[PDB]
Design a protein around this ligand. Structure first.
Ligand code: K
Ligand code: MG
Ligand code: MG
Ligand code: MG
Ligand code: MG
Ligand code: MG
Ligand code: MG
Ligand code: MG
Ligand code: MG
Ligand code: MG
Ligand code: MG
Ligand code: MG
Ligand code: MG
Ligand code: MG
Ligand code: MG
Ligand code: MG
Ligand code: MG
Ligand code: MG
Ligand code: MG
Ligand code: MG
Ligand code: MG
Ligand code: MG
Ligand code: MG
Ligand code: MG
Ligand code: MG
Ligand code: MG
Ligand code: MG
Ligand code: MG
Ligand code: MG
Ligand code: MG
Ligand code: MG
Ligand code: MG
Ligand code: MG
Ligand code: MG
Ligand code: MG
Ligand code: MG
Ligand code: MG
Ligand code: MG
Ligand code: MG
Ligand code: MG
Ligand code: MG
Ligand code: MG
Ligand code: MG
Ligand code: MG
Ligand code: MG
Ligand code: MG
Ligand code: MG
Ligand code: MG
Ligand code: MG
Ligand code: MG
Ligand code: MG
Ligand code: MG
Ligand code: MG
Ligand code: MG
Ligand code: MG
Ligand code: MG
Ligand code: ZN
Lengths: 119, 231, 56, 122, 118
RNA sequence: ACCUCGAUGUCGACUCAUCUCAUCCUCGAGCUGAAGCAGGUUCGAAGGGUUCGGCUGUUCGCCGAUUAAAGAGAUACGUGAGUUGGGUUCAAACCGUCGUGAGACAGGUUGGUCCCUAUCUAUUGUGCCCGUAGGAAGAUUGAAGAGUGUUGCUUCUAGUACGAGAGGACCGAAGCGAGGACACCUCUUAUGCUCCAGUUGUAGCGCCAGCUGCACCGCUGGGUAGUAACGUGUCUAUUAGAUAAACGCUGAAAGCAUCUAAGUGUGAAACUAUCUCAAAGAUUAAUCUUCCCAUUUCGCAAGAAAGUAAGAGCCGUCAAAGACGAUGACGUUGAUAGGUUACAGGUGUAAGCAUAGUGAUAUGUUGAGCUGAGUAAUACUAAUUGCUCGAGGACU
RNA sequence: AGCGAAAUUCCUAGUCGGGUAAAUUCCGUCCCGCUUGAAUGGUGUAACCAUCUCUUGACUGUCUCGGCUAUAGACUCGGUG
RNA sequence: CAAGGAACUCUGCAAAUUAACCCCGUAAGUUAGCGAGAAGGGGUGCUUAUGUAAAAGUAAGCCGCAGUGAAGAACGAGGGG
């Protein structure tokens, strides 16, 4: 069998994580598949804890992950993260995000999951 | 015969340098004090064995029948129970440690459950040969090997029982014999055994007297470093 | 390779004997009462005492 | 680990620049030859002023290996080229000198003449 | 009954570690004195050469020393915390990596490492 | 010329082998024109082993170098719903020869399509249901079985026994290996696609610097955990019983003799065990220990209505496990997973700043910064306050 | 005439020399050429060939000898079938 | 993909080496046209200065294991039908 689809490559996985984490930081909720939310959670928590010092080095580190969204750009998402979201989690020992399971999709029966910022 | 046995958990592998200038790889076994939970006699049972209890746990992590047995026998609650054949000479309810069982450098054998590997093919399982890769080839490259015994009514016409094909590999008991004990650590309750021990790090391990060399004890001593801090 | 003999209507059902379905475990929501499959957010977006999503 | 049909260099004065392995002497299906092993070889690149001629089948012992081997103390000896010296039935070297260093595994398997004629043993 | 496996392995390794264990980087020249034992006595054989790598954590700490005799380059892997072996750092050199593999490809005037390091 | 022409694919090679003994090696013995060493022949013995290459499609065969040995056969001259198509045997073309010719040759040469998703049975693994007569959780014995079994060199015995000499032992002991097998990752290597660093082109972040996408993971040098050998640990022993060939002791039939008829021995890698693994669906369904059942009424009792527990399952977090089941750990009375903290290992002095240089760049802060899985703590997040199944053991 | 064990040689793996540790293939030569041979042409020939055949340097997983990683399948779930 | 490098196989099938530009050098044979990109080698990055219409080049310095740093670029020799 040949002329197969490119597939879930490592680059595709990193880009998928980037898109979901940018969206979850912009809006605050993501309705995705459970196995994708359980992988985006790691990057979300890592970004939030590294964005707690607010130095230019930390901005350069985050910019390798953030992407442009509808509600914020790549530069205003930075201001939202470092001034609104991250300062809230200033003394929380990890676990800033929660993943909960919704019902199965009508056309896939796959388990959906909502990823949210735990207040 | 007079078989001595102890139970422990493998924690990892290291090396030690010894006198006579050898570098000996060793396996480290954390051996908790084992408690003799039962003794079964030849006359009353038709065989003789000793069943110990090890890997102690709190009472809330144990089922009702097992905790009832432990409280009836007046023993420390443990989640692991197993026996060794032909182990005699130990009173019920006595703590046993490998220091009282084996010597400094005697030969022992070790039994442990092998590391699980799952559904493996014929080549990885039975050390079979792989088919040719170049000069033209076919769909089956990692072929198991022709299972033909006889074609025709005057011959077998069937795959012989016990054939060598793909299947489950790993997670199976295996014993390695004639391993020399290297050192005892009373404070850390830590046994050093030469060679490699089967099983993943953290699994259960049974140390028994070697049936090939029951009384043989080959001397082994470590090396004392002569170095001195900077002059 | 193909069957040289036709499989009857009995071997077919014997193979299908293991094709039966299982009833998924269900529970009752603690704020509206409707049945939801266990360990999952209900229809009101109310999981336990936490408002997850806006009401349907 | 020198194997069947392996071209290697000769570290002695005998006129043989390139030598090819024929058999790993010692047993049936002996796969490899480590330091101190004896092999049967054929001279393939020689010189006019040499004791051996091109095409002769002779017996040699290996002294160096690129792969290398590990000793009991844990030291791993590793050279940068596979070398062998031509020996006689008595285990005596055919050449009058040995070029470069040789291993100590020779010492275990006799070969005292080879060690005494070497530049430095390792 | 929590078992810190790494700690127990460290204790077994400490039983036979050495006190000094002098330091050296990748590109360093050291003098290794092998205490070879014959039937009697010891013949201290020096293996001065250039280091190429130092890997390991404890009793399994090993380093690679490269030497050149009669134009033949020989590379030798020692264990740091091994008795009858003495290491004496001679020259400290500057390299930009931890495993300087190119030394087994570059030779002659191009196999000379500049001094100094940080 | 009995089966098959409404099709039984035919040589050789590769992979996997199994069986027989008319035995090539290893093991035991009798005779010898057997001094010793090395042989010859016969008897017993099938447990294991029985090499790599050059030429040829080759089987065969000759030759080279080893080995203890490079055994003889059968299994559709085993094996194409396992591989190949070199050979034979399609269409093309030529040479030699035959034919007036079209054409032909077990004469030669170049080239030339090898399909099938496995229903039953056989086999390798892994499950559900039920039975084992109350239920459940544990620990066992072992009827019937499976796996391995190869062997060399050196030293000593001992230059002793024997032998004019040359040469050169049986028996026994030790050390080191080759092949095969099991397990493991401390060491050496291979790999290590969300790790580190260097670096090219281009497009972006408005520009420099610094990053991101793409170019085989862009390329290159290393590399955590894991997976493996080329790596390192172990095994390939030993012993007992009954024996084959063979040798016996005591002994008659047959006053002698005689291994045999009674009685009593010796005796092989063969056999039965000792070694490893699995095993009570062994329905002939075994044994031991612990725990939980021991209601109110009506009538009908291995009867009803309700009514009584150990345990198990559904669901969730998982990996010492794993195709999916299953196995194993945990589910708030918790460290199961993620996150956080600290550390290990790996990479190799981060960005920024300051100095120096005209600049590329070097130096100091700086063994700095970064880090997928690794080690251990920490309920911060996810394992909810849920549902179902489940017991009085007939009588003899 | 030329060529000759040949795309031709049955006997034949013809003899000898070279190439290899070892060469039914290859190169040169020998000639009882069963049955070579001169326009169905004979013998040579520089260049060329997705032509055939043999030796060789570098090169490599073709192989000693197998091992690891990533995708798409296979495998599990939902839909068509 | 460590060591070996055709030991594999009917056959180096397939795979692997080389690959662009510039500067040296290039045999036997021949129909004198070729052989021939023969074979065999070296350099390529960045900065400063000199060079030019632009260059190319030249001199000095700097960094890396590696400088058409990634993509696209001929493997070769010998004998025979
Ligand atoms: K027919
Ligand atoms: Mg990419
Ligand atoms: Mg095909
Ligand atoms: Mg293929
Ligand atoms: Mg019949
Ligand atoms: Mg039959
Ligand atoms: Mg029906
Ligand atoms: Mg079904
Ligand atoms: Mg008839
Ligand atoms: Mg028939
Ligand atoms: Mg038919
Ligand atoms: Mg048919
Ligand atoms: Mg067929
Ligand atoms: Mg016989
Ligand atoms: Mg036996
Ligand atoms: Mg050849
Ligand atoms: Mg026949
Ligand atoms: Mg056949
Ligand atoms: Mg046959
Ligand atoms: Mg016939
Ligand atoms: Mg078949
Ligand atoms: Mg076939
Ligand atoms: Mg086929
Ligand atoms: Mg068939
Ligand atoms: Mg053909
Ligand atoms: Mg073909
Ligand atoms: Mg034709
Ligand atoms: Mg005619
Ligand atoms: Mg049975
Ligand atoms: Mg390690
Ligand atoms: Mg820039
Ligand atoms: Mg016996
Ligand atoms: Mg008598
Ligand atoms: Mg007997
Ligand atoms: Mg019945
Ligand atoms: Mg964890
Ligand atoms: Mg810096
Ligand atoms: Mg003539
Ligand atoms: Mg002539
Ligand atoms: Mg010919
Ligand atoms: Mg010849
Ligand atoms: Mg041919
Ligand atoms: Mg000729
Ligand atoms: Mg003619
Ligand atoms: Mg004519
Ligand atoms: Mg001609
Ligand atoms: Mg052509
Ligand atoms: Mg897919
Ligand atoms: Mg489906
Ligand atoms: Mg390789
Ligand atoms: Mg090489
Ligand atoms: Mg060949
Ligand atoms: Mg062959
Ligand atoms: Mg090709
Ligand atoms: Mg030419
Ligand atoms: Mg000619
Ligand atoms: Zn609700």
């Amino acid at each position: 069998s040949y002329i197969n689809k490119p597939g879930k490559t490592s680059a595709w996985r990193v880009m998928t994580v980037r898109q979901q984490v940018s969206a979850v930081l912009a809006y605050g909720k993501i309705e995705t598949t459970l196995k994708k939310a359980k992988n985006t959670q790691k990057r979300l928590d890592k970004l939030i804890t590294l964005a707690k010092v607010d130095n230019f080095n930390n901005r350069r580190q985050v910019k390798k992950w953030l992407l442009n969204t509808n509600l914020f750009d790549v530069d205003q998402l930075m201001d939202h993260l470092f001034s609104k979201v991250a300062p809230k989690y200033e003394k929380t020992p990890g676990g800033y995000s929660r993943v909960l399971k919704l019902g199965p999709r009508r056309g896939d029966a796959t388990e959906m999951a909502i990823l949210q910022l735990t207040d | 015969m007079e078989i001595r046995g102890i139970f422990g958990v493998k924690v990892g592998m290291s090396q030690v340098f010894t006198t006579n200038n050898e570098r000996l790889p060793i396996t480290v076994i954390y051996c908790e004090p084992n408690q003799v939970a039962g003794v079964k006699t030849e006359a009353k049972d038709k065989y003789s064995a000793t069943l110990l209890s090890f890997d102690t746990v709190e009472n809330k992590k144990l089922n009702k029948p097992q905790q009832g047995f432990f409280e009836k026998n007046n023993l420390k609650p443990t989640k692991h129970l197993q026996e060794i054949r032909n182990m005699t000479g130990f009173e019920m309810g006595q703590q046993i440690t490998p220091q009282n069982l084996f010597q400094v450098g005697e030969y022992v054998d070790v039994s442990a459950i092998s590391k699980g590997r799952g559904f493996t093919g014929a080549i990885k399982r039975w050390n079979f040969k792989i088919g040719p890769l170049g000069h033209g080839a076919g769909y089956p490259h990692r072929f198991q090997g022709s299972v033909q015994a006889g074609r025709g009514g005057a011959s077998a016409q069937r795959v012989f029982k016990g054939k060598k094909m793909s299947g489950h590999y790993g997670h199976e008991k295996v014993t390695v014999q004639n391993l020399r004990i290297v050192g005892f650590d009373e404070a850390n309750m830590l046994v050093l055994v030469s060679g490699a021990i089967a099983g993943p790090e953290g699994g259960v391990v049974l140390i028994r007297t070697a049936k090939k060399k029951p009384g043989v004890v080959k001397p082994i001593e470590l090396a004392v470093q002569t170095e001195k801090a900077p002059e | 390779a193909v069957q040289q003999r036709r499989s009857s209507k009995h071997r077919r059902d014997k193979r299908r004997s293991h094709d039966a379905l299982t009833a998924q475990a269900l529970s009752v929501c603690q704020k509206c009462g409707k049945k939801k499959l266990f360990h999952r957010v209900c229809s009101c977006g109310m999981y336990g005492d936490l408002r997850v999503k806006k009401a349907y | 680990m020198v194997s069947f049909m392996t071209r290697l260099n000769v570290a002695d004065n005998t006129g043989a620049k390139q030598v090819g392995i024929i058999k790993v002497l010692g047993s049936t299906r002996k796969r490899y030859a480590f330091l101190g092993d004896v092999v049967v070889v054929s001279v393939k690149d020689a010189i006019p002023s040499g004791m051996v001629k091109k095409g002769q089948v002779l017996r040699a012992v290996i002294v160096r290996t690129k792969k290398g081997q590990q000793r009991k103390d844990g030291t791993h000896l590793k050279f940068d080229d596979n070398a062998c010296v031509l020996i006689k039935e008595d285990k005596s070297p055919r050449g009058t000198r040995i070029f470069g260093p040789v291993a100590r595994e020779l010492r275990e398997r006799g070969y005292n003449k080879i060690l005494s004629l070497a530049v430095e043993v390792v | 009954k929590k078992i810190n496996k790494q700690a127990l392995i460290d204790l077994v390794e400490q039983k036979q570690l050495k006190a000094y264990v002098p330091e050296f980087s990748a590109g360093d020249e050291v003098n290794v004195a092998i205490k070879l034992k014959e039937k009697e006595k010891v013949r201290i054989q020096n293996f001065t050469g250039t280091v190429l790598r130092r890997r390991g954590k404890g009793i399994s700490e090993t380093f690679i020393v490269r030497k050149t005799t009669d134009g033949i380059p020989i590379e030798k892997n020692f264990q740091i915390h091994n008795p009858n072996i003495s290491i004496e750092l001679k020259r400290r050199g500057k390299v930009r990596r931890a495993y300087i593999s190119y030394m087994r490809e570059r030779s002659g005037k191009a196999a000379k490492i500049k001094e100094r390091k940080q």
